[PDB]
Design a protein around this ligand. Sequence first.
Ligand SMILES: CCCCCCCCCCCCO[C@@H]1O[C@H](CO)[C@@H](O[C@H]2O[C@H](CO)[C@@H](O)[C@H](O)[C@H]2O)[C@H](O)[C@H]1O
Ligand SMILES: CCCCCCCCOCCOCCOCCOCCO
Ligand SMILES: CCCCCCCCOCCOCCOCCOCCO
Lengths: 49, 902, 150, 99, 13, 13, 481, 49
Amino acid sequence: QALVTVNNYTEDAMGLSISTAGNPDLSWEKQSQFNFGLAAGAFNNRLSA
Amino acid sequence: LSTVSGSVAKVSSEKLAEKPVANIMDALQGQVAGMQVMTTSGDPTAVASVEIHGTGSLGASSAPLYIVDGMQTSLDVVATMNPNDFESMSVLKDASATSIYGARAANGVVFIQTKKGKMSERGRITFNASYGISQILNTKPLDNMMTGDELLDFQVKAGFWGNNQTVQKVKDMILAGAEDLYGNYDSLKDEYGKTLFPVDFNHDADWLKALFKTAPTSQGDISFSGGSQGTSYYASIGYFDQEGMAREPANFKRYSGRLNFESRINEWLKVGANLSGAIANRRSADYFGKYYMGSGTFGVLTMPRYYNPFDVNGDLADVYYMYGATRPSMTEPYFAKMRPFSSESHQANVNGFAQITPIKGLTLKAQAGVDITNTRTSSKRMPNNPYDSTPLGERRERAYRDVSKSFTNTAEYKFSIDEKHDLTALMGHEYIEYEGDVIGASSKGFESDKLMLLSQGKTGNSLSLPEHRVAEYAYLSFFSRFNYGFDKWMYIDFSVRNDQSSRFGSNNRSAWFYSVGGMFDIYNKFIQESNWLSDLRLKMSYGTTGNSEIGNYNHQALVTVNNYTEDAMGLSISTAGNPDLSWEKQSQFNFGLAAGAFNNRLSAEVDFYVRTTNDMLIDVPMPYISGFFSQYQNVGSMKNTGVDLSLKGTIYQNKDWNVYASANFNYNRQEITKLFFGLNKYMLPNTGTIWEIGYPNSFYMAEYAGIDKKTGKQLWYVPGQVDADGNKVTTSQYSADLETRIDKSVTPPITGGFSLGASWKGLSLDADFAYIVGKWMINNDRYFTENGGGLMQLNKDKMLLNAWTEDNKETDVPKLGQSPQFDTHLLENASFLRLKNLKLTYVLPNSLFAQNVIGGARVYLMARNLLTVTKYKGFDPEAGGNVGKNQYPNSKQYVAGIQLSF
Amino acid sequence: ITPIKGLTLKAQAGVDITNTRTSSKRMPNNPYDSTPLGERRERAYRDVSKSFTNTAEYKFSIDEKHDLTALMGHEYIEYEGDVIGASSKGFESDKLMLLSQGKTGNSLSLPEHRVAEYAYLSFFSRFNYGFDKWMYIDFSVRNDQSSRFG
Amino acid sequence: WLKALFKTAPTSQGDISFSGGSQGTSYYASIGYFDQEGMAREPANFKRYSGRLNFESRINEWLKVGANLSGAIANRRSADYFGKYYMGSGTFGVLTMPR
Amino acid sequence: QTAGANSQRGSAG
Amino acid sequence: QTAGANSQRGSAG
Amino acid sequence: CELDRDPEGKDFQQPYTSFVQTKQNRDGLYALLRNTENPRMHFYQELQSDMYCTTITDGNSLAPFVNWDLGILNDHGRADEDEVSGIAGYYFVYNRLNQQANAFVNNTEAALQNQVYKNSTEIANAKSFLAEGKVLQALAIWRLMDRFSFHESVTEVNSGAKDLGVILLKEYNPGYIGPRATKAQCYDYILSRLSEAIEVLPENRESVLYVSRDYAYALRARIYLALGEYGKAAADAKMVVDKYPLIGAADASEFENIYRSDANNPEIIFRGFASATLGSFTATTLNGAAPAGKDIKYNPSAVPFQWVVDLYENEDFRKSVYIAKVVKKDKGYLVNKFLEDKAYRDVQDKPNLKVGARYFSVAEVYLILVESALQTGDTPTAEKYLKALSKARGAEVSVVNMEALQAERTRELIGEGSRLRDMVRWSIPNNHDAFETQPGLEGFANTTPLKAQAPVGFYAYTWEFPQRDRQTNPQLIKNWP
Amino acid sequence: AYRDVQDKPNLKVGARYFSVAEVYLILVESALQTGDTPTAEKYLKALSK
Ligand SMILES: CCCCCCCCCCCCO[C@@H]1O[C@H](CO)[C@@H](O[C@H]2O[C@H](CO)[C@@H](O)[C@H](O)[C@H]2O)[C@H](O)[C@H]1O
Ligand SMILES: CCCCCCCCOCCOCCOCCOCCO
Ligand SMILES: CCCCCCCCOCCOCCOCCOCCO
């Protein structure tokens, strides 16, 4: 959102100041992950890797 | 739960489940002999007051101790619990039964046990849901009030509008004044005469509609219950919303949960917990009971009908008008929009118990629990409202914290010295502790509804001090209770306990109490087994109890902040102090008799009791010369002698028909036996009540005698003064000297109820009545409605059209121009019989789920407070003690509901 | 709820609630302070994080040598949180330190007030295939929306 | 100046569990205590009083329910000068204070 | 607050 | 705050 | 297990063991005074005079005093944790001032005795705080005497109360319940407290916010005038009357800006601390004033009779500040003496109608002196000061001759609760039923006849002791027959 | 005027943006750089006096 907020100069009236720049197209950050794995175990199952 | 020599009544799940008000105690009005339940306002957020066997104190509190599964719980916190989880509620009425409880056992003890699991192979899941409405239960006060035309002509003749005037001249002026006012608002100056007709002498505005509405109540439920092999469980989630029928918003909303479990973990250990919680929204209508123009039922009668708060569409306008106003007045719905309020209370009740049985007869039980309330409330004054006195808005935020802890540890040894002699010994330690908290902050000068964080208010002269209150109390107790069993017919049990409290000083805070109890099974020693009689037991109790239910810091001679300047601190004397302040001591004798007949097809029990109060905590009123209002002292004494009786029979019972009924009664004579400083009487100023030795708290006022038919002046009897044989003196000169004790009690002496029930093959009807007989009440509304000598801008009763005149002397209405006095003519009989509950219920037959999921279903129609019987001329004879005052009348309700079982 | 073989419908719901009170003081009459006037600040924090997850899972064996598992799911999480705080100063005594008892005028101050909320709405799926008992394939698609974007 | 600003601090915790079940109904209860005192003399600590009730049950052939309830009373304090450079404060002051 | 006279709650308070 | 130079954080922050 | 719980935000009563503790208790007393000698608390007796009629707007709040509804006046008011108003409230806040002043007076006396102060300067200030406490005792007991004891002119009373004063409790004693002292005991206590304070207090006032010797003389000149001791009243007046200059203004709005300003009004001898955020209050009983954005709008429940309006020459500055033509827009007069100190507004744009508690302005010392000087044959001093005050206000009186003193005093003191007292002293019955209501206000301010007549000597000019005191104290002899 | 309690310094000030003594020193400096030593004499001796 592009925002304004209270920023009072005197005590008898309200004052506004721009608070944020904004970005209307803000959306998800999108990640991908390729993963290649190898499980194993040896000697009955007395040694996993 | 308690003892066999005790006065005890048990109400089961039926009378608690699924009533359409949050105020659980109201379901017990007229259900328990000697227990007087009364709710003085129909605001859904109001809570019932309860008195067991009269009032015990003129200063301390009459409220019973409320206890849920062995945890002292406030009614406010009971209100956040789903009552469909309540297996039963036990009312403990005499000293022998209230022995293992303290703090204020002298008021009796209301014990609530929640449901427990039923150890079955298939668990029991049951769903409930209900929808219904609330509407004001009595509109009779509206019937004899003046019309628009009657009021305007009454006023004009009475001289209220000037002496030189007519009906038409006045309506021109009021019309001119509305048009002129509304023409100062860009939001009205083009609506006046098109959409807003605030003044209208050719139609009467319906001020009942303007201030009251039909409001919905909905609630729904799903329970889980079962268990297996020592482990048990009952779980439940539920919803409840009840809206207030006044247009001033008021509601009670609750989203609730409970998990009860327990398990025999091994041969010696059983453990368990009764967990419950809620999110709760509670909103009060905070103008009722005060006299505000156009507000509440007071305004429903006293608003002139020629003022109109609706628009051309029959919805309320934002604003309305009265002559002379320089700002139009806001209606309820609009005021509510400009004054939003929310409150969200988080309520957690965590507890557990261990039950260790190390040898035969030895049960050691330690139990501990905390009830936590965190409540946030937000309140606004909306900015830029043209009908407000500032465009600047305001906002107030509040955080409430209530922490209340309990630990109760008991050892119980059950052994028999032979087989015709039985003994059980019990000893206990109880610690209770409460710490409570509220902080509040507020800001103002807001110029935009989108910019209303407290941090965004104006600084400087718009700033304000925060709110802050703190409160603490604590109860240390050690107690004991023994039971003896001769043969199978003579039972004696005895108890002694010591109680110490936060609320008294170190050298006065500890008190010893005891009780002796007897039960004698006349039937099973001296009647063998017989024909008609099934049961006969004699019961008797003498014992003492404490009441300490006063404020938390009432003995200290205190000083407080009271600043003069902004640069240095000011100190001022805050309290008077009373270092001896200590316990109120109550003793009670009880003589009971219970019987069963035919074969306990007719049950009955009647009890006689003398309840005495010494070192009575009176918040003694002090002369204003003292510079204080009151200081608590142990000064008074009071007596409550009464009887309560109760019977229950099965009337007719076929193979396919079953009718039953029940009824209870109490009569209770109160008597002040000692007041303070040797005073024989003390009239409570501006209440119309008096304390006087030898009598109950009684009303106290002049006796109105009528009018002198030749003057039109009001007349009062001169009390204790008489004439020839035409006797009772009268005077047209009112003076307080004419006031005298009236023989009507301020607390009603008679308290009973009765229930009728019939079931004919799956269909069932159930009626539940309650009555309060002997109730009297000053109808304060009628000081205004029947006033011929003041508040002449208000709508009055039609009777004033017949007021006395030199040309209309054959009347009892007094000549206009004289104020009423608070005498017997306002003292109304508020006794009443209410049909509290009427439930037609159809249990779907087993034959339809023949289908391995649904087990059964029920549907029901139900009404609450369908019928009232009373002579009271105000809206609600129950909506008050002492004085009836702009009441938020109790509600009638209509509800349809369905139950499912799997 | 398991209504037919393989089919499992799980409804799950929870709310986590935090209520916190903090209390802070500047003790009066400290000789080693810049001023003998004391100060006090009180704060109340609230966090309500609600969450509902609703899933339907269907497992069925279609061959002895072919097991398929399908799961549709719905999920809504939302959070409201705030804090408020007030503070007072100019106390001249240890025993008289309620916020209501501060000096007024130039000793006053605005309260503290922050509010935060967010929510998420989710629809998701997960599929599990199993030929013989050596080759397994998982496949997932889901959609997410968040209050944190327009 | 090390001992001027850091101390040995105690850490203590207790615990009791209940667990078991019969015929398709399980439970797990717990209450516990935990206090970890901050070793910087600047006070800091985490105290908690825990409760947990875990529950699960097969009611009938087609329905199984459960709850995993937990709660706590917790006391958090933090030493709020660390990571900043104030004379006399923190491990910074332990080294940099004239002896 | 048009109270011509309201009795205050005696025994109700 | 007698700091002649603290780098503020980043990665840490 | 410790069961002790004491309330946060409160401390225990303890004897004064330090000068700082003494000063704090002194201030707390002056905070009490601020809500005691308060204009709100004197509006009831202002309305009971012959100056007002009730309007169609009144909600029977003002009618009992305005129309003499004795059935309401008898036990009028409240003092409780929720409201302290009316005759009861008046009676309570002055007794509490007394009880709490008693405690300050006796505790400073014990502290001087026990020599708990640290040097010769603390000792002399405590001796002054002592004197200050005495003046407040005097003011409390006299304001009770002024409404609750009969004057000499009363006809029928209840048997014995014609020369009773008030219950005169001289020590801090909450539990005390005793009979009424005689009038002589009361007035001699009030005057001996005052005279002891005049010997100790300095000649020049330290602060407008604290009791001064100037105030004590001013308060004793008031009390002497109320007792008909003119030569003594005049003598006290002359000590103070020249010490405070009358407001100099060239036109009414210049008068208003000075007058309504607590801080700049040089006539104020002794006021209570007020800021927007402590010590200021709305006092809208008379005018019925309400903010409306940047403007003030009015809907009064009581407005002066027409004769009160004609009291003021149309150029009298008070004709626009003390009373103001702002009923029904601009069609009649209400009493506007208490409209506002603008300094107490939250936002300067926005009226919030707050004033402060003033305890004596020098104009009252002019009238006290003029009346006494007239009564003692000292017509030059009466001529000077009535011509001086009336001229400063924009309408110098032509004749100086008691009749104008009555006119001028009434003009100056409207709203301050004097005219009832003046009716009794000047032997004026309440001629309410014969007064013309303001003509431009008809339909709004109409005629309401007295529910009871108030001839000269009528007992109800003195209030009855509150019911609470009557019911709780069988030794209390009541005022009304 | 910006103290919380009149007794107690809190050493608060406000933002000042221009005061005529700086205007005097601009005028005196410029008057000297342009020959108007009359103006420079007058204003510099005024400020310094
Ligand atoms: C194996 C079985 C277990 C046995 C355990 C029994 C333990 C018994 C210990 C009792 C002693 C505890 O002592 C008691 O502690 C509680 C809280 O715990 C204090 O409680 C209170 O104290 C003061 C009074 O405002 C405050 O500081 C505090 O916030 C408040 O909670 C009591 O004032 C103290 O006297
Ligand atoms: C060593 C003893 C262990 C005792 C610990 C018990 C823990 C109890 O704390 C629970 C705190 O819950 C407060 C939550 O606030 C309200 C939440 O209500 C939820 C409503 O659904
Ligand atoms: C043996 C002691 C166990 C203590 C555990 C306490 C856990 C804290 O819970 C917070 C309290 O809220 C209780 C609400 O219960 C929810 C019930 O709803 C479950 C229905 O499925």
